[PDB]
Symmetry: C4
Subunit: 257 residues, 4 copies
């Protein structure tokens, strides 16, 4: 069904990495390269239009809601709303972020999914750098930056960013009840990825704060057909049924927190 391993050919090393910020709807489609893969994260399906098309090379989800996101992704595929080749769980392999049970049982529950830390741990210098900042200074990169690192470790050489700026009703039912991230840390981490691994990073949204830090991609007069989402499109994270498997999973997660 989906990819065993995500292999990047030296003939196509372009990747579009998108967050879910406002600028996602303000993409300058003329600046996109003619060839590219797309990385989406978290609640990307909440989008009312296919701002980056229906074919996603990889999606990224946080461990806290992986159970529901994994299920939501399967359904997005089954309902033909998106084509998803890979599903990653954005991880750092740190015991105070991901419990041992979670990491150790990950593949038992999600055999075709992938733990992100096994990919970024290869960026030895960058990896040691984010763990040092996390552990001793409480600084953590956001999903967009995490995806950039993943793209770099995988072999992409040119990155185009959008949606990086600086509904949850089902989330409210999932989590009954109501400072490590920062614009500066994100930028610094992005600049480090650039200088260490020699890759290019462009912005795609003309009026984004992001554009003040990275050069907007060249307007090569590219075109794009913006397709609107269907009426009954999944627009919120899916809830899970209390089956024996789900109750076992949730019971164990709750304990570890």
């Amino acid at each position: 069904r989906m990819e065993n391993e995500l292999i990047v050919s030296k003939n196509m090393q372009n990747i579009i990495i998108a967050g879910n910020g406002p600028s996602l709807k303000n993409i300058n489609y003329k600046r996109l390269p003619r060839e590219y893969d797309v990385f989406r994260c978290n609640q990307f399906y909440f989008e009312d239009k296919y701002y980056l098309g229906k074919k996603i090379k990889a999606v990224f989800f946080n461990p806290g809601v992986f159970l529901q996101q994994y299920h939501t992704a399967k359904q997005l595929i089954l309902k033909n709303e998106y084509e998803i080749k890979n599903i990653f769980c954005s991880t750092f392999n740190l015991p105070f972020i991901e419990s041992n049970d979670f990491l150790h049982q990950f593949y038992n529950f999600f055999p075709d999914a992938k733990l992100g830390y096994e990919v970024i741990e290869n960026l030895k210098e960058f990896y040691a750098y984010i763990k040092y900042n996390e552990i001793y200074f409480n600084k953590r990169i956001t999903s967009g930056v995490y995806m950039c690192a993943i793209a770099i470790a995988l072999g992409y050489k040119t990155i185009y960013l959008c949606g990086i700026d600086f509904m949850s009703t089902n989330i409210k039912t999932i989590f009954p009840g109501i400072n490590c991230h920062s614009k500066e840390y994100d930028i610094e981490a992005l600049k480090l990825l650039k200088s260490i691994y020699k890759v290019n990073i462009y912005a795609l949204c003309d009026d984004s704060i992001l554009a003040n830090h990275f050069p907007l991609s060249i307007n090569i007069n590219n075109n794009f057909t913006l397709e609107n989402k269907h009426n009954n499109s999944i627009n919120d994270i899916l809830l899970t049924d209390n089956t024996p498997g789900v109750s076992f999973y949730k019971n164990q997660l709750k304990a570890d927190n």
Copy 2:
């Protein structure tokens, strides 16, 4: 004594997979291929006649009663009632189905046995498919389907089914006291195995519900000598003695439940 690894030669890729349903006694022996291996499961020895002969390529048992079935199989071999080349424990490697202790101590207790999940986990697409259904929808395939997947992952290309329809006195003493399986899920899973791995699946029992879903094998006028079971044949699952090893095993199993 028995096989280290079950290897299928490209010269003989026929496998007969049998459940213990009524249709087991209504096999149309003329439809069997001239060459084939046989897979049996659970309480197959309860059979009053050798409906499929004495030579079994592999037997399959559920973890819940593996201790007693393993012992029962050894005795079936020792008493010359059957020839058994492999013994599998039908597993999925899911913590809410098989405890960690069970899986982790499996080979320590049964060195010449085999964990089924290590075989079917290679059918990547099918594997992800049954885990998704199990975990999120409480749907589980039955032993016959499990055996089909095992046969496919091992290299068999043509499957012939029987005994798939849709005493326990020693079982009652083993378990003092008295919804995930379904005809539809089984069929769907079988059809998926067929379309993904390109194999053929035939029925062998003319008057079975199974025949309404899979094509009866061609009557090639094959013959079969139906041998009756001897008087003192083991016809019920064997009970174990409360040795230090068995009491340790049972004590730990009981805890995990």
Copy 3:
């Protein structure tokens, strides 16, 4: 200091395996082969004379007293009483015999020692056979038989037995306070090792019960210099000091029992 791996050359496949029974002093030295390695077990050093010389290829100790035996062996070497090339811990890798902590921490405490089960587990048929008998029937082979299996798995083809028949003051201080073994099981297991792995097994003591089951080796008029043990020879298992390491080890052992 001692051997990393015990390798048997096809030029010398003779091994002398000795228990500590009475017949140890009644060895017919004329029957020994001209070339051979020696395996000793448990309290072999209690011997008042070097009934089999000072050079031992491997010694075997039970887990229950391994801590003290390991220490005792080191001292036997340091004091020049014996030359010991390998030290094995006779194990089966069964949780009701060896705790998980013991097995898992084994090499951390005894880096140059060796777990026997990692050697005999290669005798697949024999291994499955002893585990079946142990677990379901409470039958266990004795050290002499264990050593035979180890010798066979290592490559020796001809076995010569002695000391197999069918002080502890420091043992009494080690264990303050006061049915799985049998002559028949031992013989049967020895006969099985013979028929499965095609090796020869001879007896060396003319007046031993063992000689009624295995053929005495041919009197090839071999000679032997029986050296008496020195006055201050270690003749009892050594006691350990309550260092932080020993107290930690003993505290954990006690718990697991």
Copy 4:
């Protein structure tokens, strides 16, 4: 940033190993070889002058304060006070010295660091020798000796010692509150490393007790520029902030003690 693996070329096998004893300031710089790498340990940065320069091939820290030392080393590098190519945690892989959690989570917290025991465990004879002495006699080698073993296992053939003789205010705040090491054990262990692995060991300090046991290196009229440390040099072990990662780490360490 720093080395993945510390490789010693056969063209440069000289290593300078220094403790923090008084003799560190009494080094006879004329005796140093023209080519060499340097190993420093523990509170080496407390030094008021660069007695061995600014380029350290590897630093060694004890597990008890690794969290703070790791952080201190990163800062020494960032502040340009020292160049550090490798960071080792001096370990023996013994459960009564290093908790299982510590060892098992080590790389998760310090991805670019290195566990020393994985290096010295290759000196099979020496390794078995120190574990035997530690466990049964409560004798442990000091950091200088530990570094010598590490250097030898890595490929250095000639060792030059200094600082081996026989502030903590931040240490007092780290550890609120106030017999296995010995001059004789250290010397004996050093002599053993010499006779087993055929390497040379020289002293560099003319008036050190160490010089009475190892030959002072030849005065080859070598020269050395003694650079004083800057005013604001880090001269005490750095304290860590109570971030979620640090509090998790410390909470777990405290438990295991």
